[PDB]
RNA sequence: AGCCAGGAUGUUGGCUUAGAAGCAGCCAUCAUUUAAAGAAAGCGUAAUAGCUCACUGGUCGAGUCGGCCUGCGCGGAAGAU
RNA sequence: GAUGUCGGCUCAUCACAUCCUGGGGCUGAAGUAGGUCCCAAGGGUAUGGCUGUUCGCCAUUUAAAGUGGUACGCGAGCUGG
């Protein structure tokens, strides 16, 4: 069993996705044709990392995952790199709105009593990259 | 084991014991930690 | 202390005999004897045995916790058995029993043929499995230790004689 | 390595080291290192204990040294006979009496301070003890 | 809270004071007001444990000698040079 | 102190690298549902898997823990007819 | 009112802080061979070239060519460089 953070659009390039789960024993070209039946739906390049409940010899059926938060932050900042240590340099402080438009992402699949609480965890990665609120 | 005048617990799993008038350290996790006072 | 102050309960079918310090217990597995230290009053007062110190002996309670554990192992030992297993690891390692002898083959030029004591019995469901049975707890760890001593498990591959209890820590050889 | 900038005289009599100390209370910090024993503390010893202090604590708090090696010690070099004048100054010692606070520290918790002084104390030739500030 | 149960010193000075500290008592003195000074010997560990607290050297304290409850403040304290012991206390009345 | 159970949500936190996933190092070092969980203790993995403490509890029924003051002892302690 | 001093030779003897052999723990000990420490003084422990040499360098050996004490062991035993 070998895992790597696999592309949704590309299947069987040899370094990054060949070992990914086409070499686990999952059908990569029916994961990433069935998952790509699901990432024919998904936005242009969200690595939405599912949990694999799979078999060895060409059979499969997958459970699914919620799309990321870390990949979706850097859009309106105008940058595609990162700091060595945030809270000294920031990548342009962004709105609640985009941190709340990323809070649209992990809402449908949590168990809270009062749903306001999870706006804190979305900003355990915010200060940890520089995305502090006004 | 290592034999020295000063014998000490080097980890939690170490244990002091006196066996024939000799302070020793036994460790279940690291044989490097075995010590005899001497 | 807590060990001594918990009484030794004897179940049905174990005849006990207190001749002062010298004390023996009889069972289906067989007679077992002990000669306790002078600092231990041992008493029949029930269908149990009780352990406490004899005034005039500083050790005292220490011996009584010892004595308690011993008889408990004896009382258990005569009714039910003590059984230590030993698993052999090694491509060409194997064991066989001939009656009161275990003929071990452990990668030696000579053959290892270990002789058992009076009340220990060894079987082998597998070429690489020894299974002792005996009333005494001390003799069966002494025998299992001796058998373990011929080929004590080496760390790298875990090759040798191991107790099946034994968990062996494996290390990797010096790089390059 | 501490040493007087200037001294009135080059060489001092051997003297004696009797009595209890002055500078017996912690005066500048919260915690201190107090001598129990008696004996000379050389400048090299004081610097080594100080080096070990300031590293057990990393840029944390403040450290004071309450002793100063102001006494010059002499040695005749190897293969010189007795006499022919007093020897040459080789090192500087502070005379220590039982009770002398040797170093003081604040700005760190106690527990780090117990550990800092334990390492420093290993460098010194005198029994020591941890001590705390006292009110009135 | 601090109620020190004290006795009166029958002999004074160095020999007598050392004889006390060898017996887990230490000398002390009460002064102030216009009453004459009063030399007391205290039990060491009793006073030792109480002066560990902070409100021993700031609040009013009371010393009982011959039954009489004498109120005081702690004024000066002679500590041992290199031990957690006590040589002498000055108590001022208040 | 013995003896049963869990270690999760963002998430492979970010950087780097051929890959760094709690566990190379580096900065954020806060959340989260909750009875609980250090952005993770060393092991371990090429790296993840895995391993398990911290973590909070249940059943168990009398003392237990670890610092200070000291007393007497222990080690530290090898030499030549 | 004398205790002959370097090295060699002959003969040695003790100590062990052990060079080999023996027994062992840790190893960044796969094996072979090592490293380090612990126990052990029973026995064993070079020939030559150069130099008065001790020593040392070099050549070639050996399982190893141990370290020290004995008036830097030994000239009423030899030598006398
Ligand atoms: Mg006098
Ligand atoms: Mg030896
Ligand atoms: Mg013999
Ligand atoms: Mg030669
Ligand atoms: Mg010799
Ligand atoms: Mg000589
Ligand atoms: Mg002679
Ligand atoms: Mg000549
Ligand atoms: Zn250990």
From TrEMBL, chain B:
One of its GO terms (biological process) is translation. Disulfide bonds join 11-14, 11-27. The keyword Nucleotidyltransferase does not apply. The keyword Ribonucleoprotein applies. One of its GO terms (cellular component) is ribonucleoprotein complex. One of its GO terms (molecular function) is structural constituent of ribosome. PANTHER family: 50S RIBOSOMAL PROTEIN L36, CHLOROPLASTIC, LARGE RIBOSOMAL SUBUNIT PROTEIN BL36C. This is Large ribosomal subunit protein bL36. The lineage of its organism: Bacteria, Pseudomonadati, Pseudomonadota, Gammaproteobacteria, Enterobacterales. The gene is rpmJ.
């Amino acid at each position: 069993y070998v895992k790597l953070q696999v592309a949704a659009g590309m299947a069987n390039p040899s370094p990054p996705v060949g070992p990914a789960l086409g070499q686990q024993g999952v059908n990569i070209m029916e994961f990433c044709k069935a998952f790509n039946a699901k990432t024919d739906s998904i936005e242009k390049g969200l690595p939405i990392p599912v949990v694999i409940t799979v078999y060895a010899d060409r059979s499969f059926t997958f459970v699914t995952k919620t799309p990321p938060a870390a990949v979706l932050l850097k859009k309106a900042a105008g940058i595609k790199s990162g700091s060595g240590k945030p809270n000294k340099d920031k990548v342009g402080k962004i709105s609640r709105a985009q941190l709340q438009e990323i809070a649209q992402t992990k809402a449908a699949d949590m168990t809270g009593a009062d749903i306001e609480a999870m706006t804190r965890s979305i900003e355990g990665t915010a200060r940890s990259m520089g995305l502090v609120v006004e | 084991m290592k034999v020295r005048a000063s014998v000490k617990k080097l980890c939690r799993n170490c244990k002091i014991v006196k066996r024939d008038g000799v302070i020793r350290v036994i460790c279940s996790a690291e044989p490097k930690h075995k010590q005899r006072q001497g | 202390s807590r060990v001594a102050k918990a009484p030794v309960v004897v179940p049905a079918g174990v005849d006990v005999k207190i001749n002062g310090q010298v004390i023996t217990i009889k069972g289906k597995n067989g007679e077992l004897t002990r000669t306790l230290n002078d600092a231990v009053e041992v008493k029949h007062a029930d269908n149990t045995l009780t352990f406490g110190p004899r005034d005039g002996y500083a050790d005292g309670w220490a011996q009584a916790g010892t004595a308690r554990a011993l008889l408990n192992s004896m009382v258990i030992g005569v009714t039910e058995g003590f059984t230590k297993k030993l698993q052999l690891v090694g491509v060409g390692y194997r064991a066989a029993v001939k009656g009161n002898v275990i003929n071990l083959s452990l990668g030696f030029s000579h053959p290892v043929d270990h002789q058992l004591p009076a009340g220990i019995t060894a079987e082998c469901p597998t070429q690489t499995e020894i299974v002792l049975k005996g009333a005494d707890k001390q003799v069966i760890g002494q025998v299992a230790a001796d058998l373990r001593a011929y080929r004590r498990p080496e760390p790298y591959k875990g090759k040798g004689v191991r107790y099946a209890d034994e968990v062996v820590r494996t290390k990797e050889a010096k790089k390059k | 390595m501490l040493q007087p900038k200037r001294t009135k005289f080059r060489k001092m009599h051997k003297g004696r080291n009797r009595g209890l100390a002055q500078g017996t209370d912690v005066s500048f910090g919260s915690f201190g290192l107090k001598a129990v024993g008696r004996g000379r503390l050389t400048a090299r010893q004081i610097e080594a204990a100080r080096r070990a202090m300031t590293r057990a604590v990393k840029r944390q708090g403040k450290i004071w040294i309450r002793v100063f090696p102001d006494k010059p010690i002499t040695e005749k070099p190897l293969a010189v006979r007795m006499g022919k004048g007093k020897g040459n100054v080789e090192y500087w010692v502070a005379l220590i009496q039982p009770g002398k606070v040797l170093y003081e520290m604040d700005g760190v918790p106690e527990e780090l301070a117990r550990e800092a002084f334990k390492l420093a104390a290993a460098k010194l030739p005198i029994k020591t003890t941890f001590v705390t500030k006292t009110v009135m | 809270m601090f109620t020190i149960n004290a006795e009166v010193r029958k002999e004074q000075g160095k020999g007598a004071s050392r004889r006390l500290r060898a017996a887990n008592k230490f000398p002390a003195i009460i002064y102030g007001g216009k009453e004459a000074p009063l030399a007391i010997e205290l039990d060491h560990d009793k006073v030792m444990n109480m002066q560990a607290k902070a409100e021993f050297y700031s609040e009013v304290l009371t010393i009982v000698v011959d039954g009489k409850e004498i109120k005081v403040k702690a004024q000066d304290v002679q500590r041992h040079p290199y031990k957690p012991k006590l040589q002498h206390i000055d108590f001022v009345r208040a």
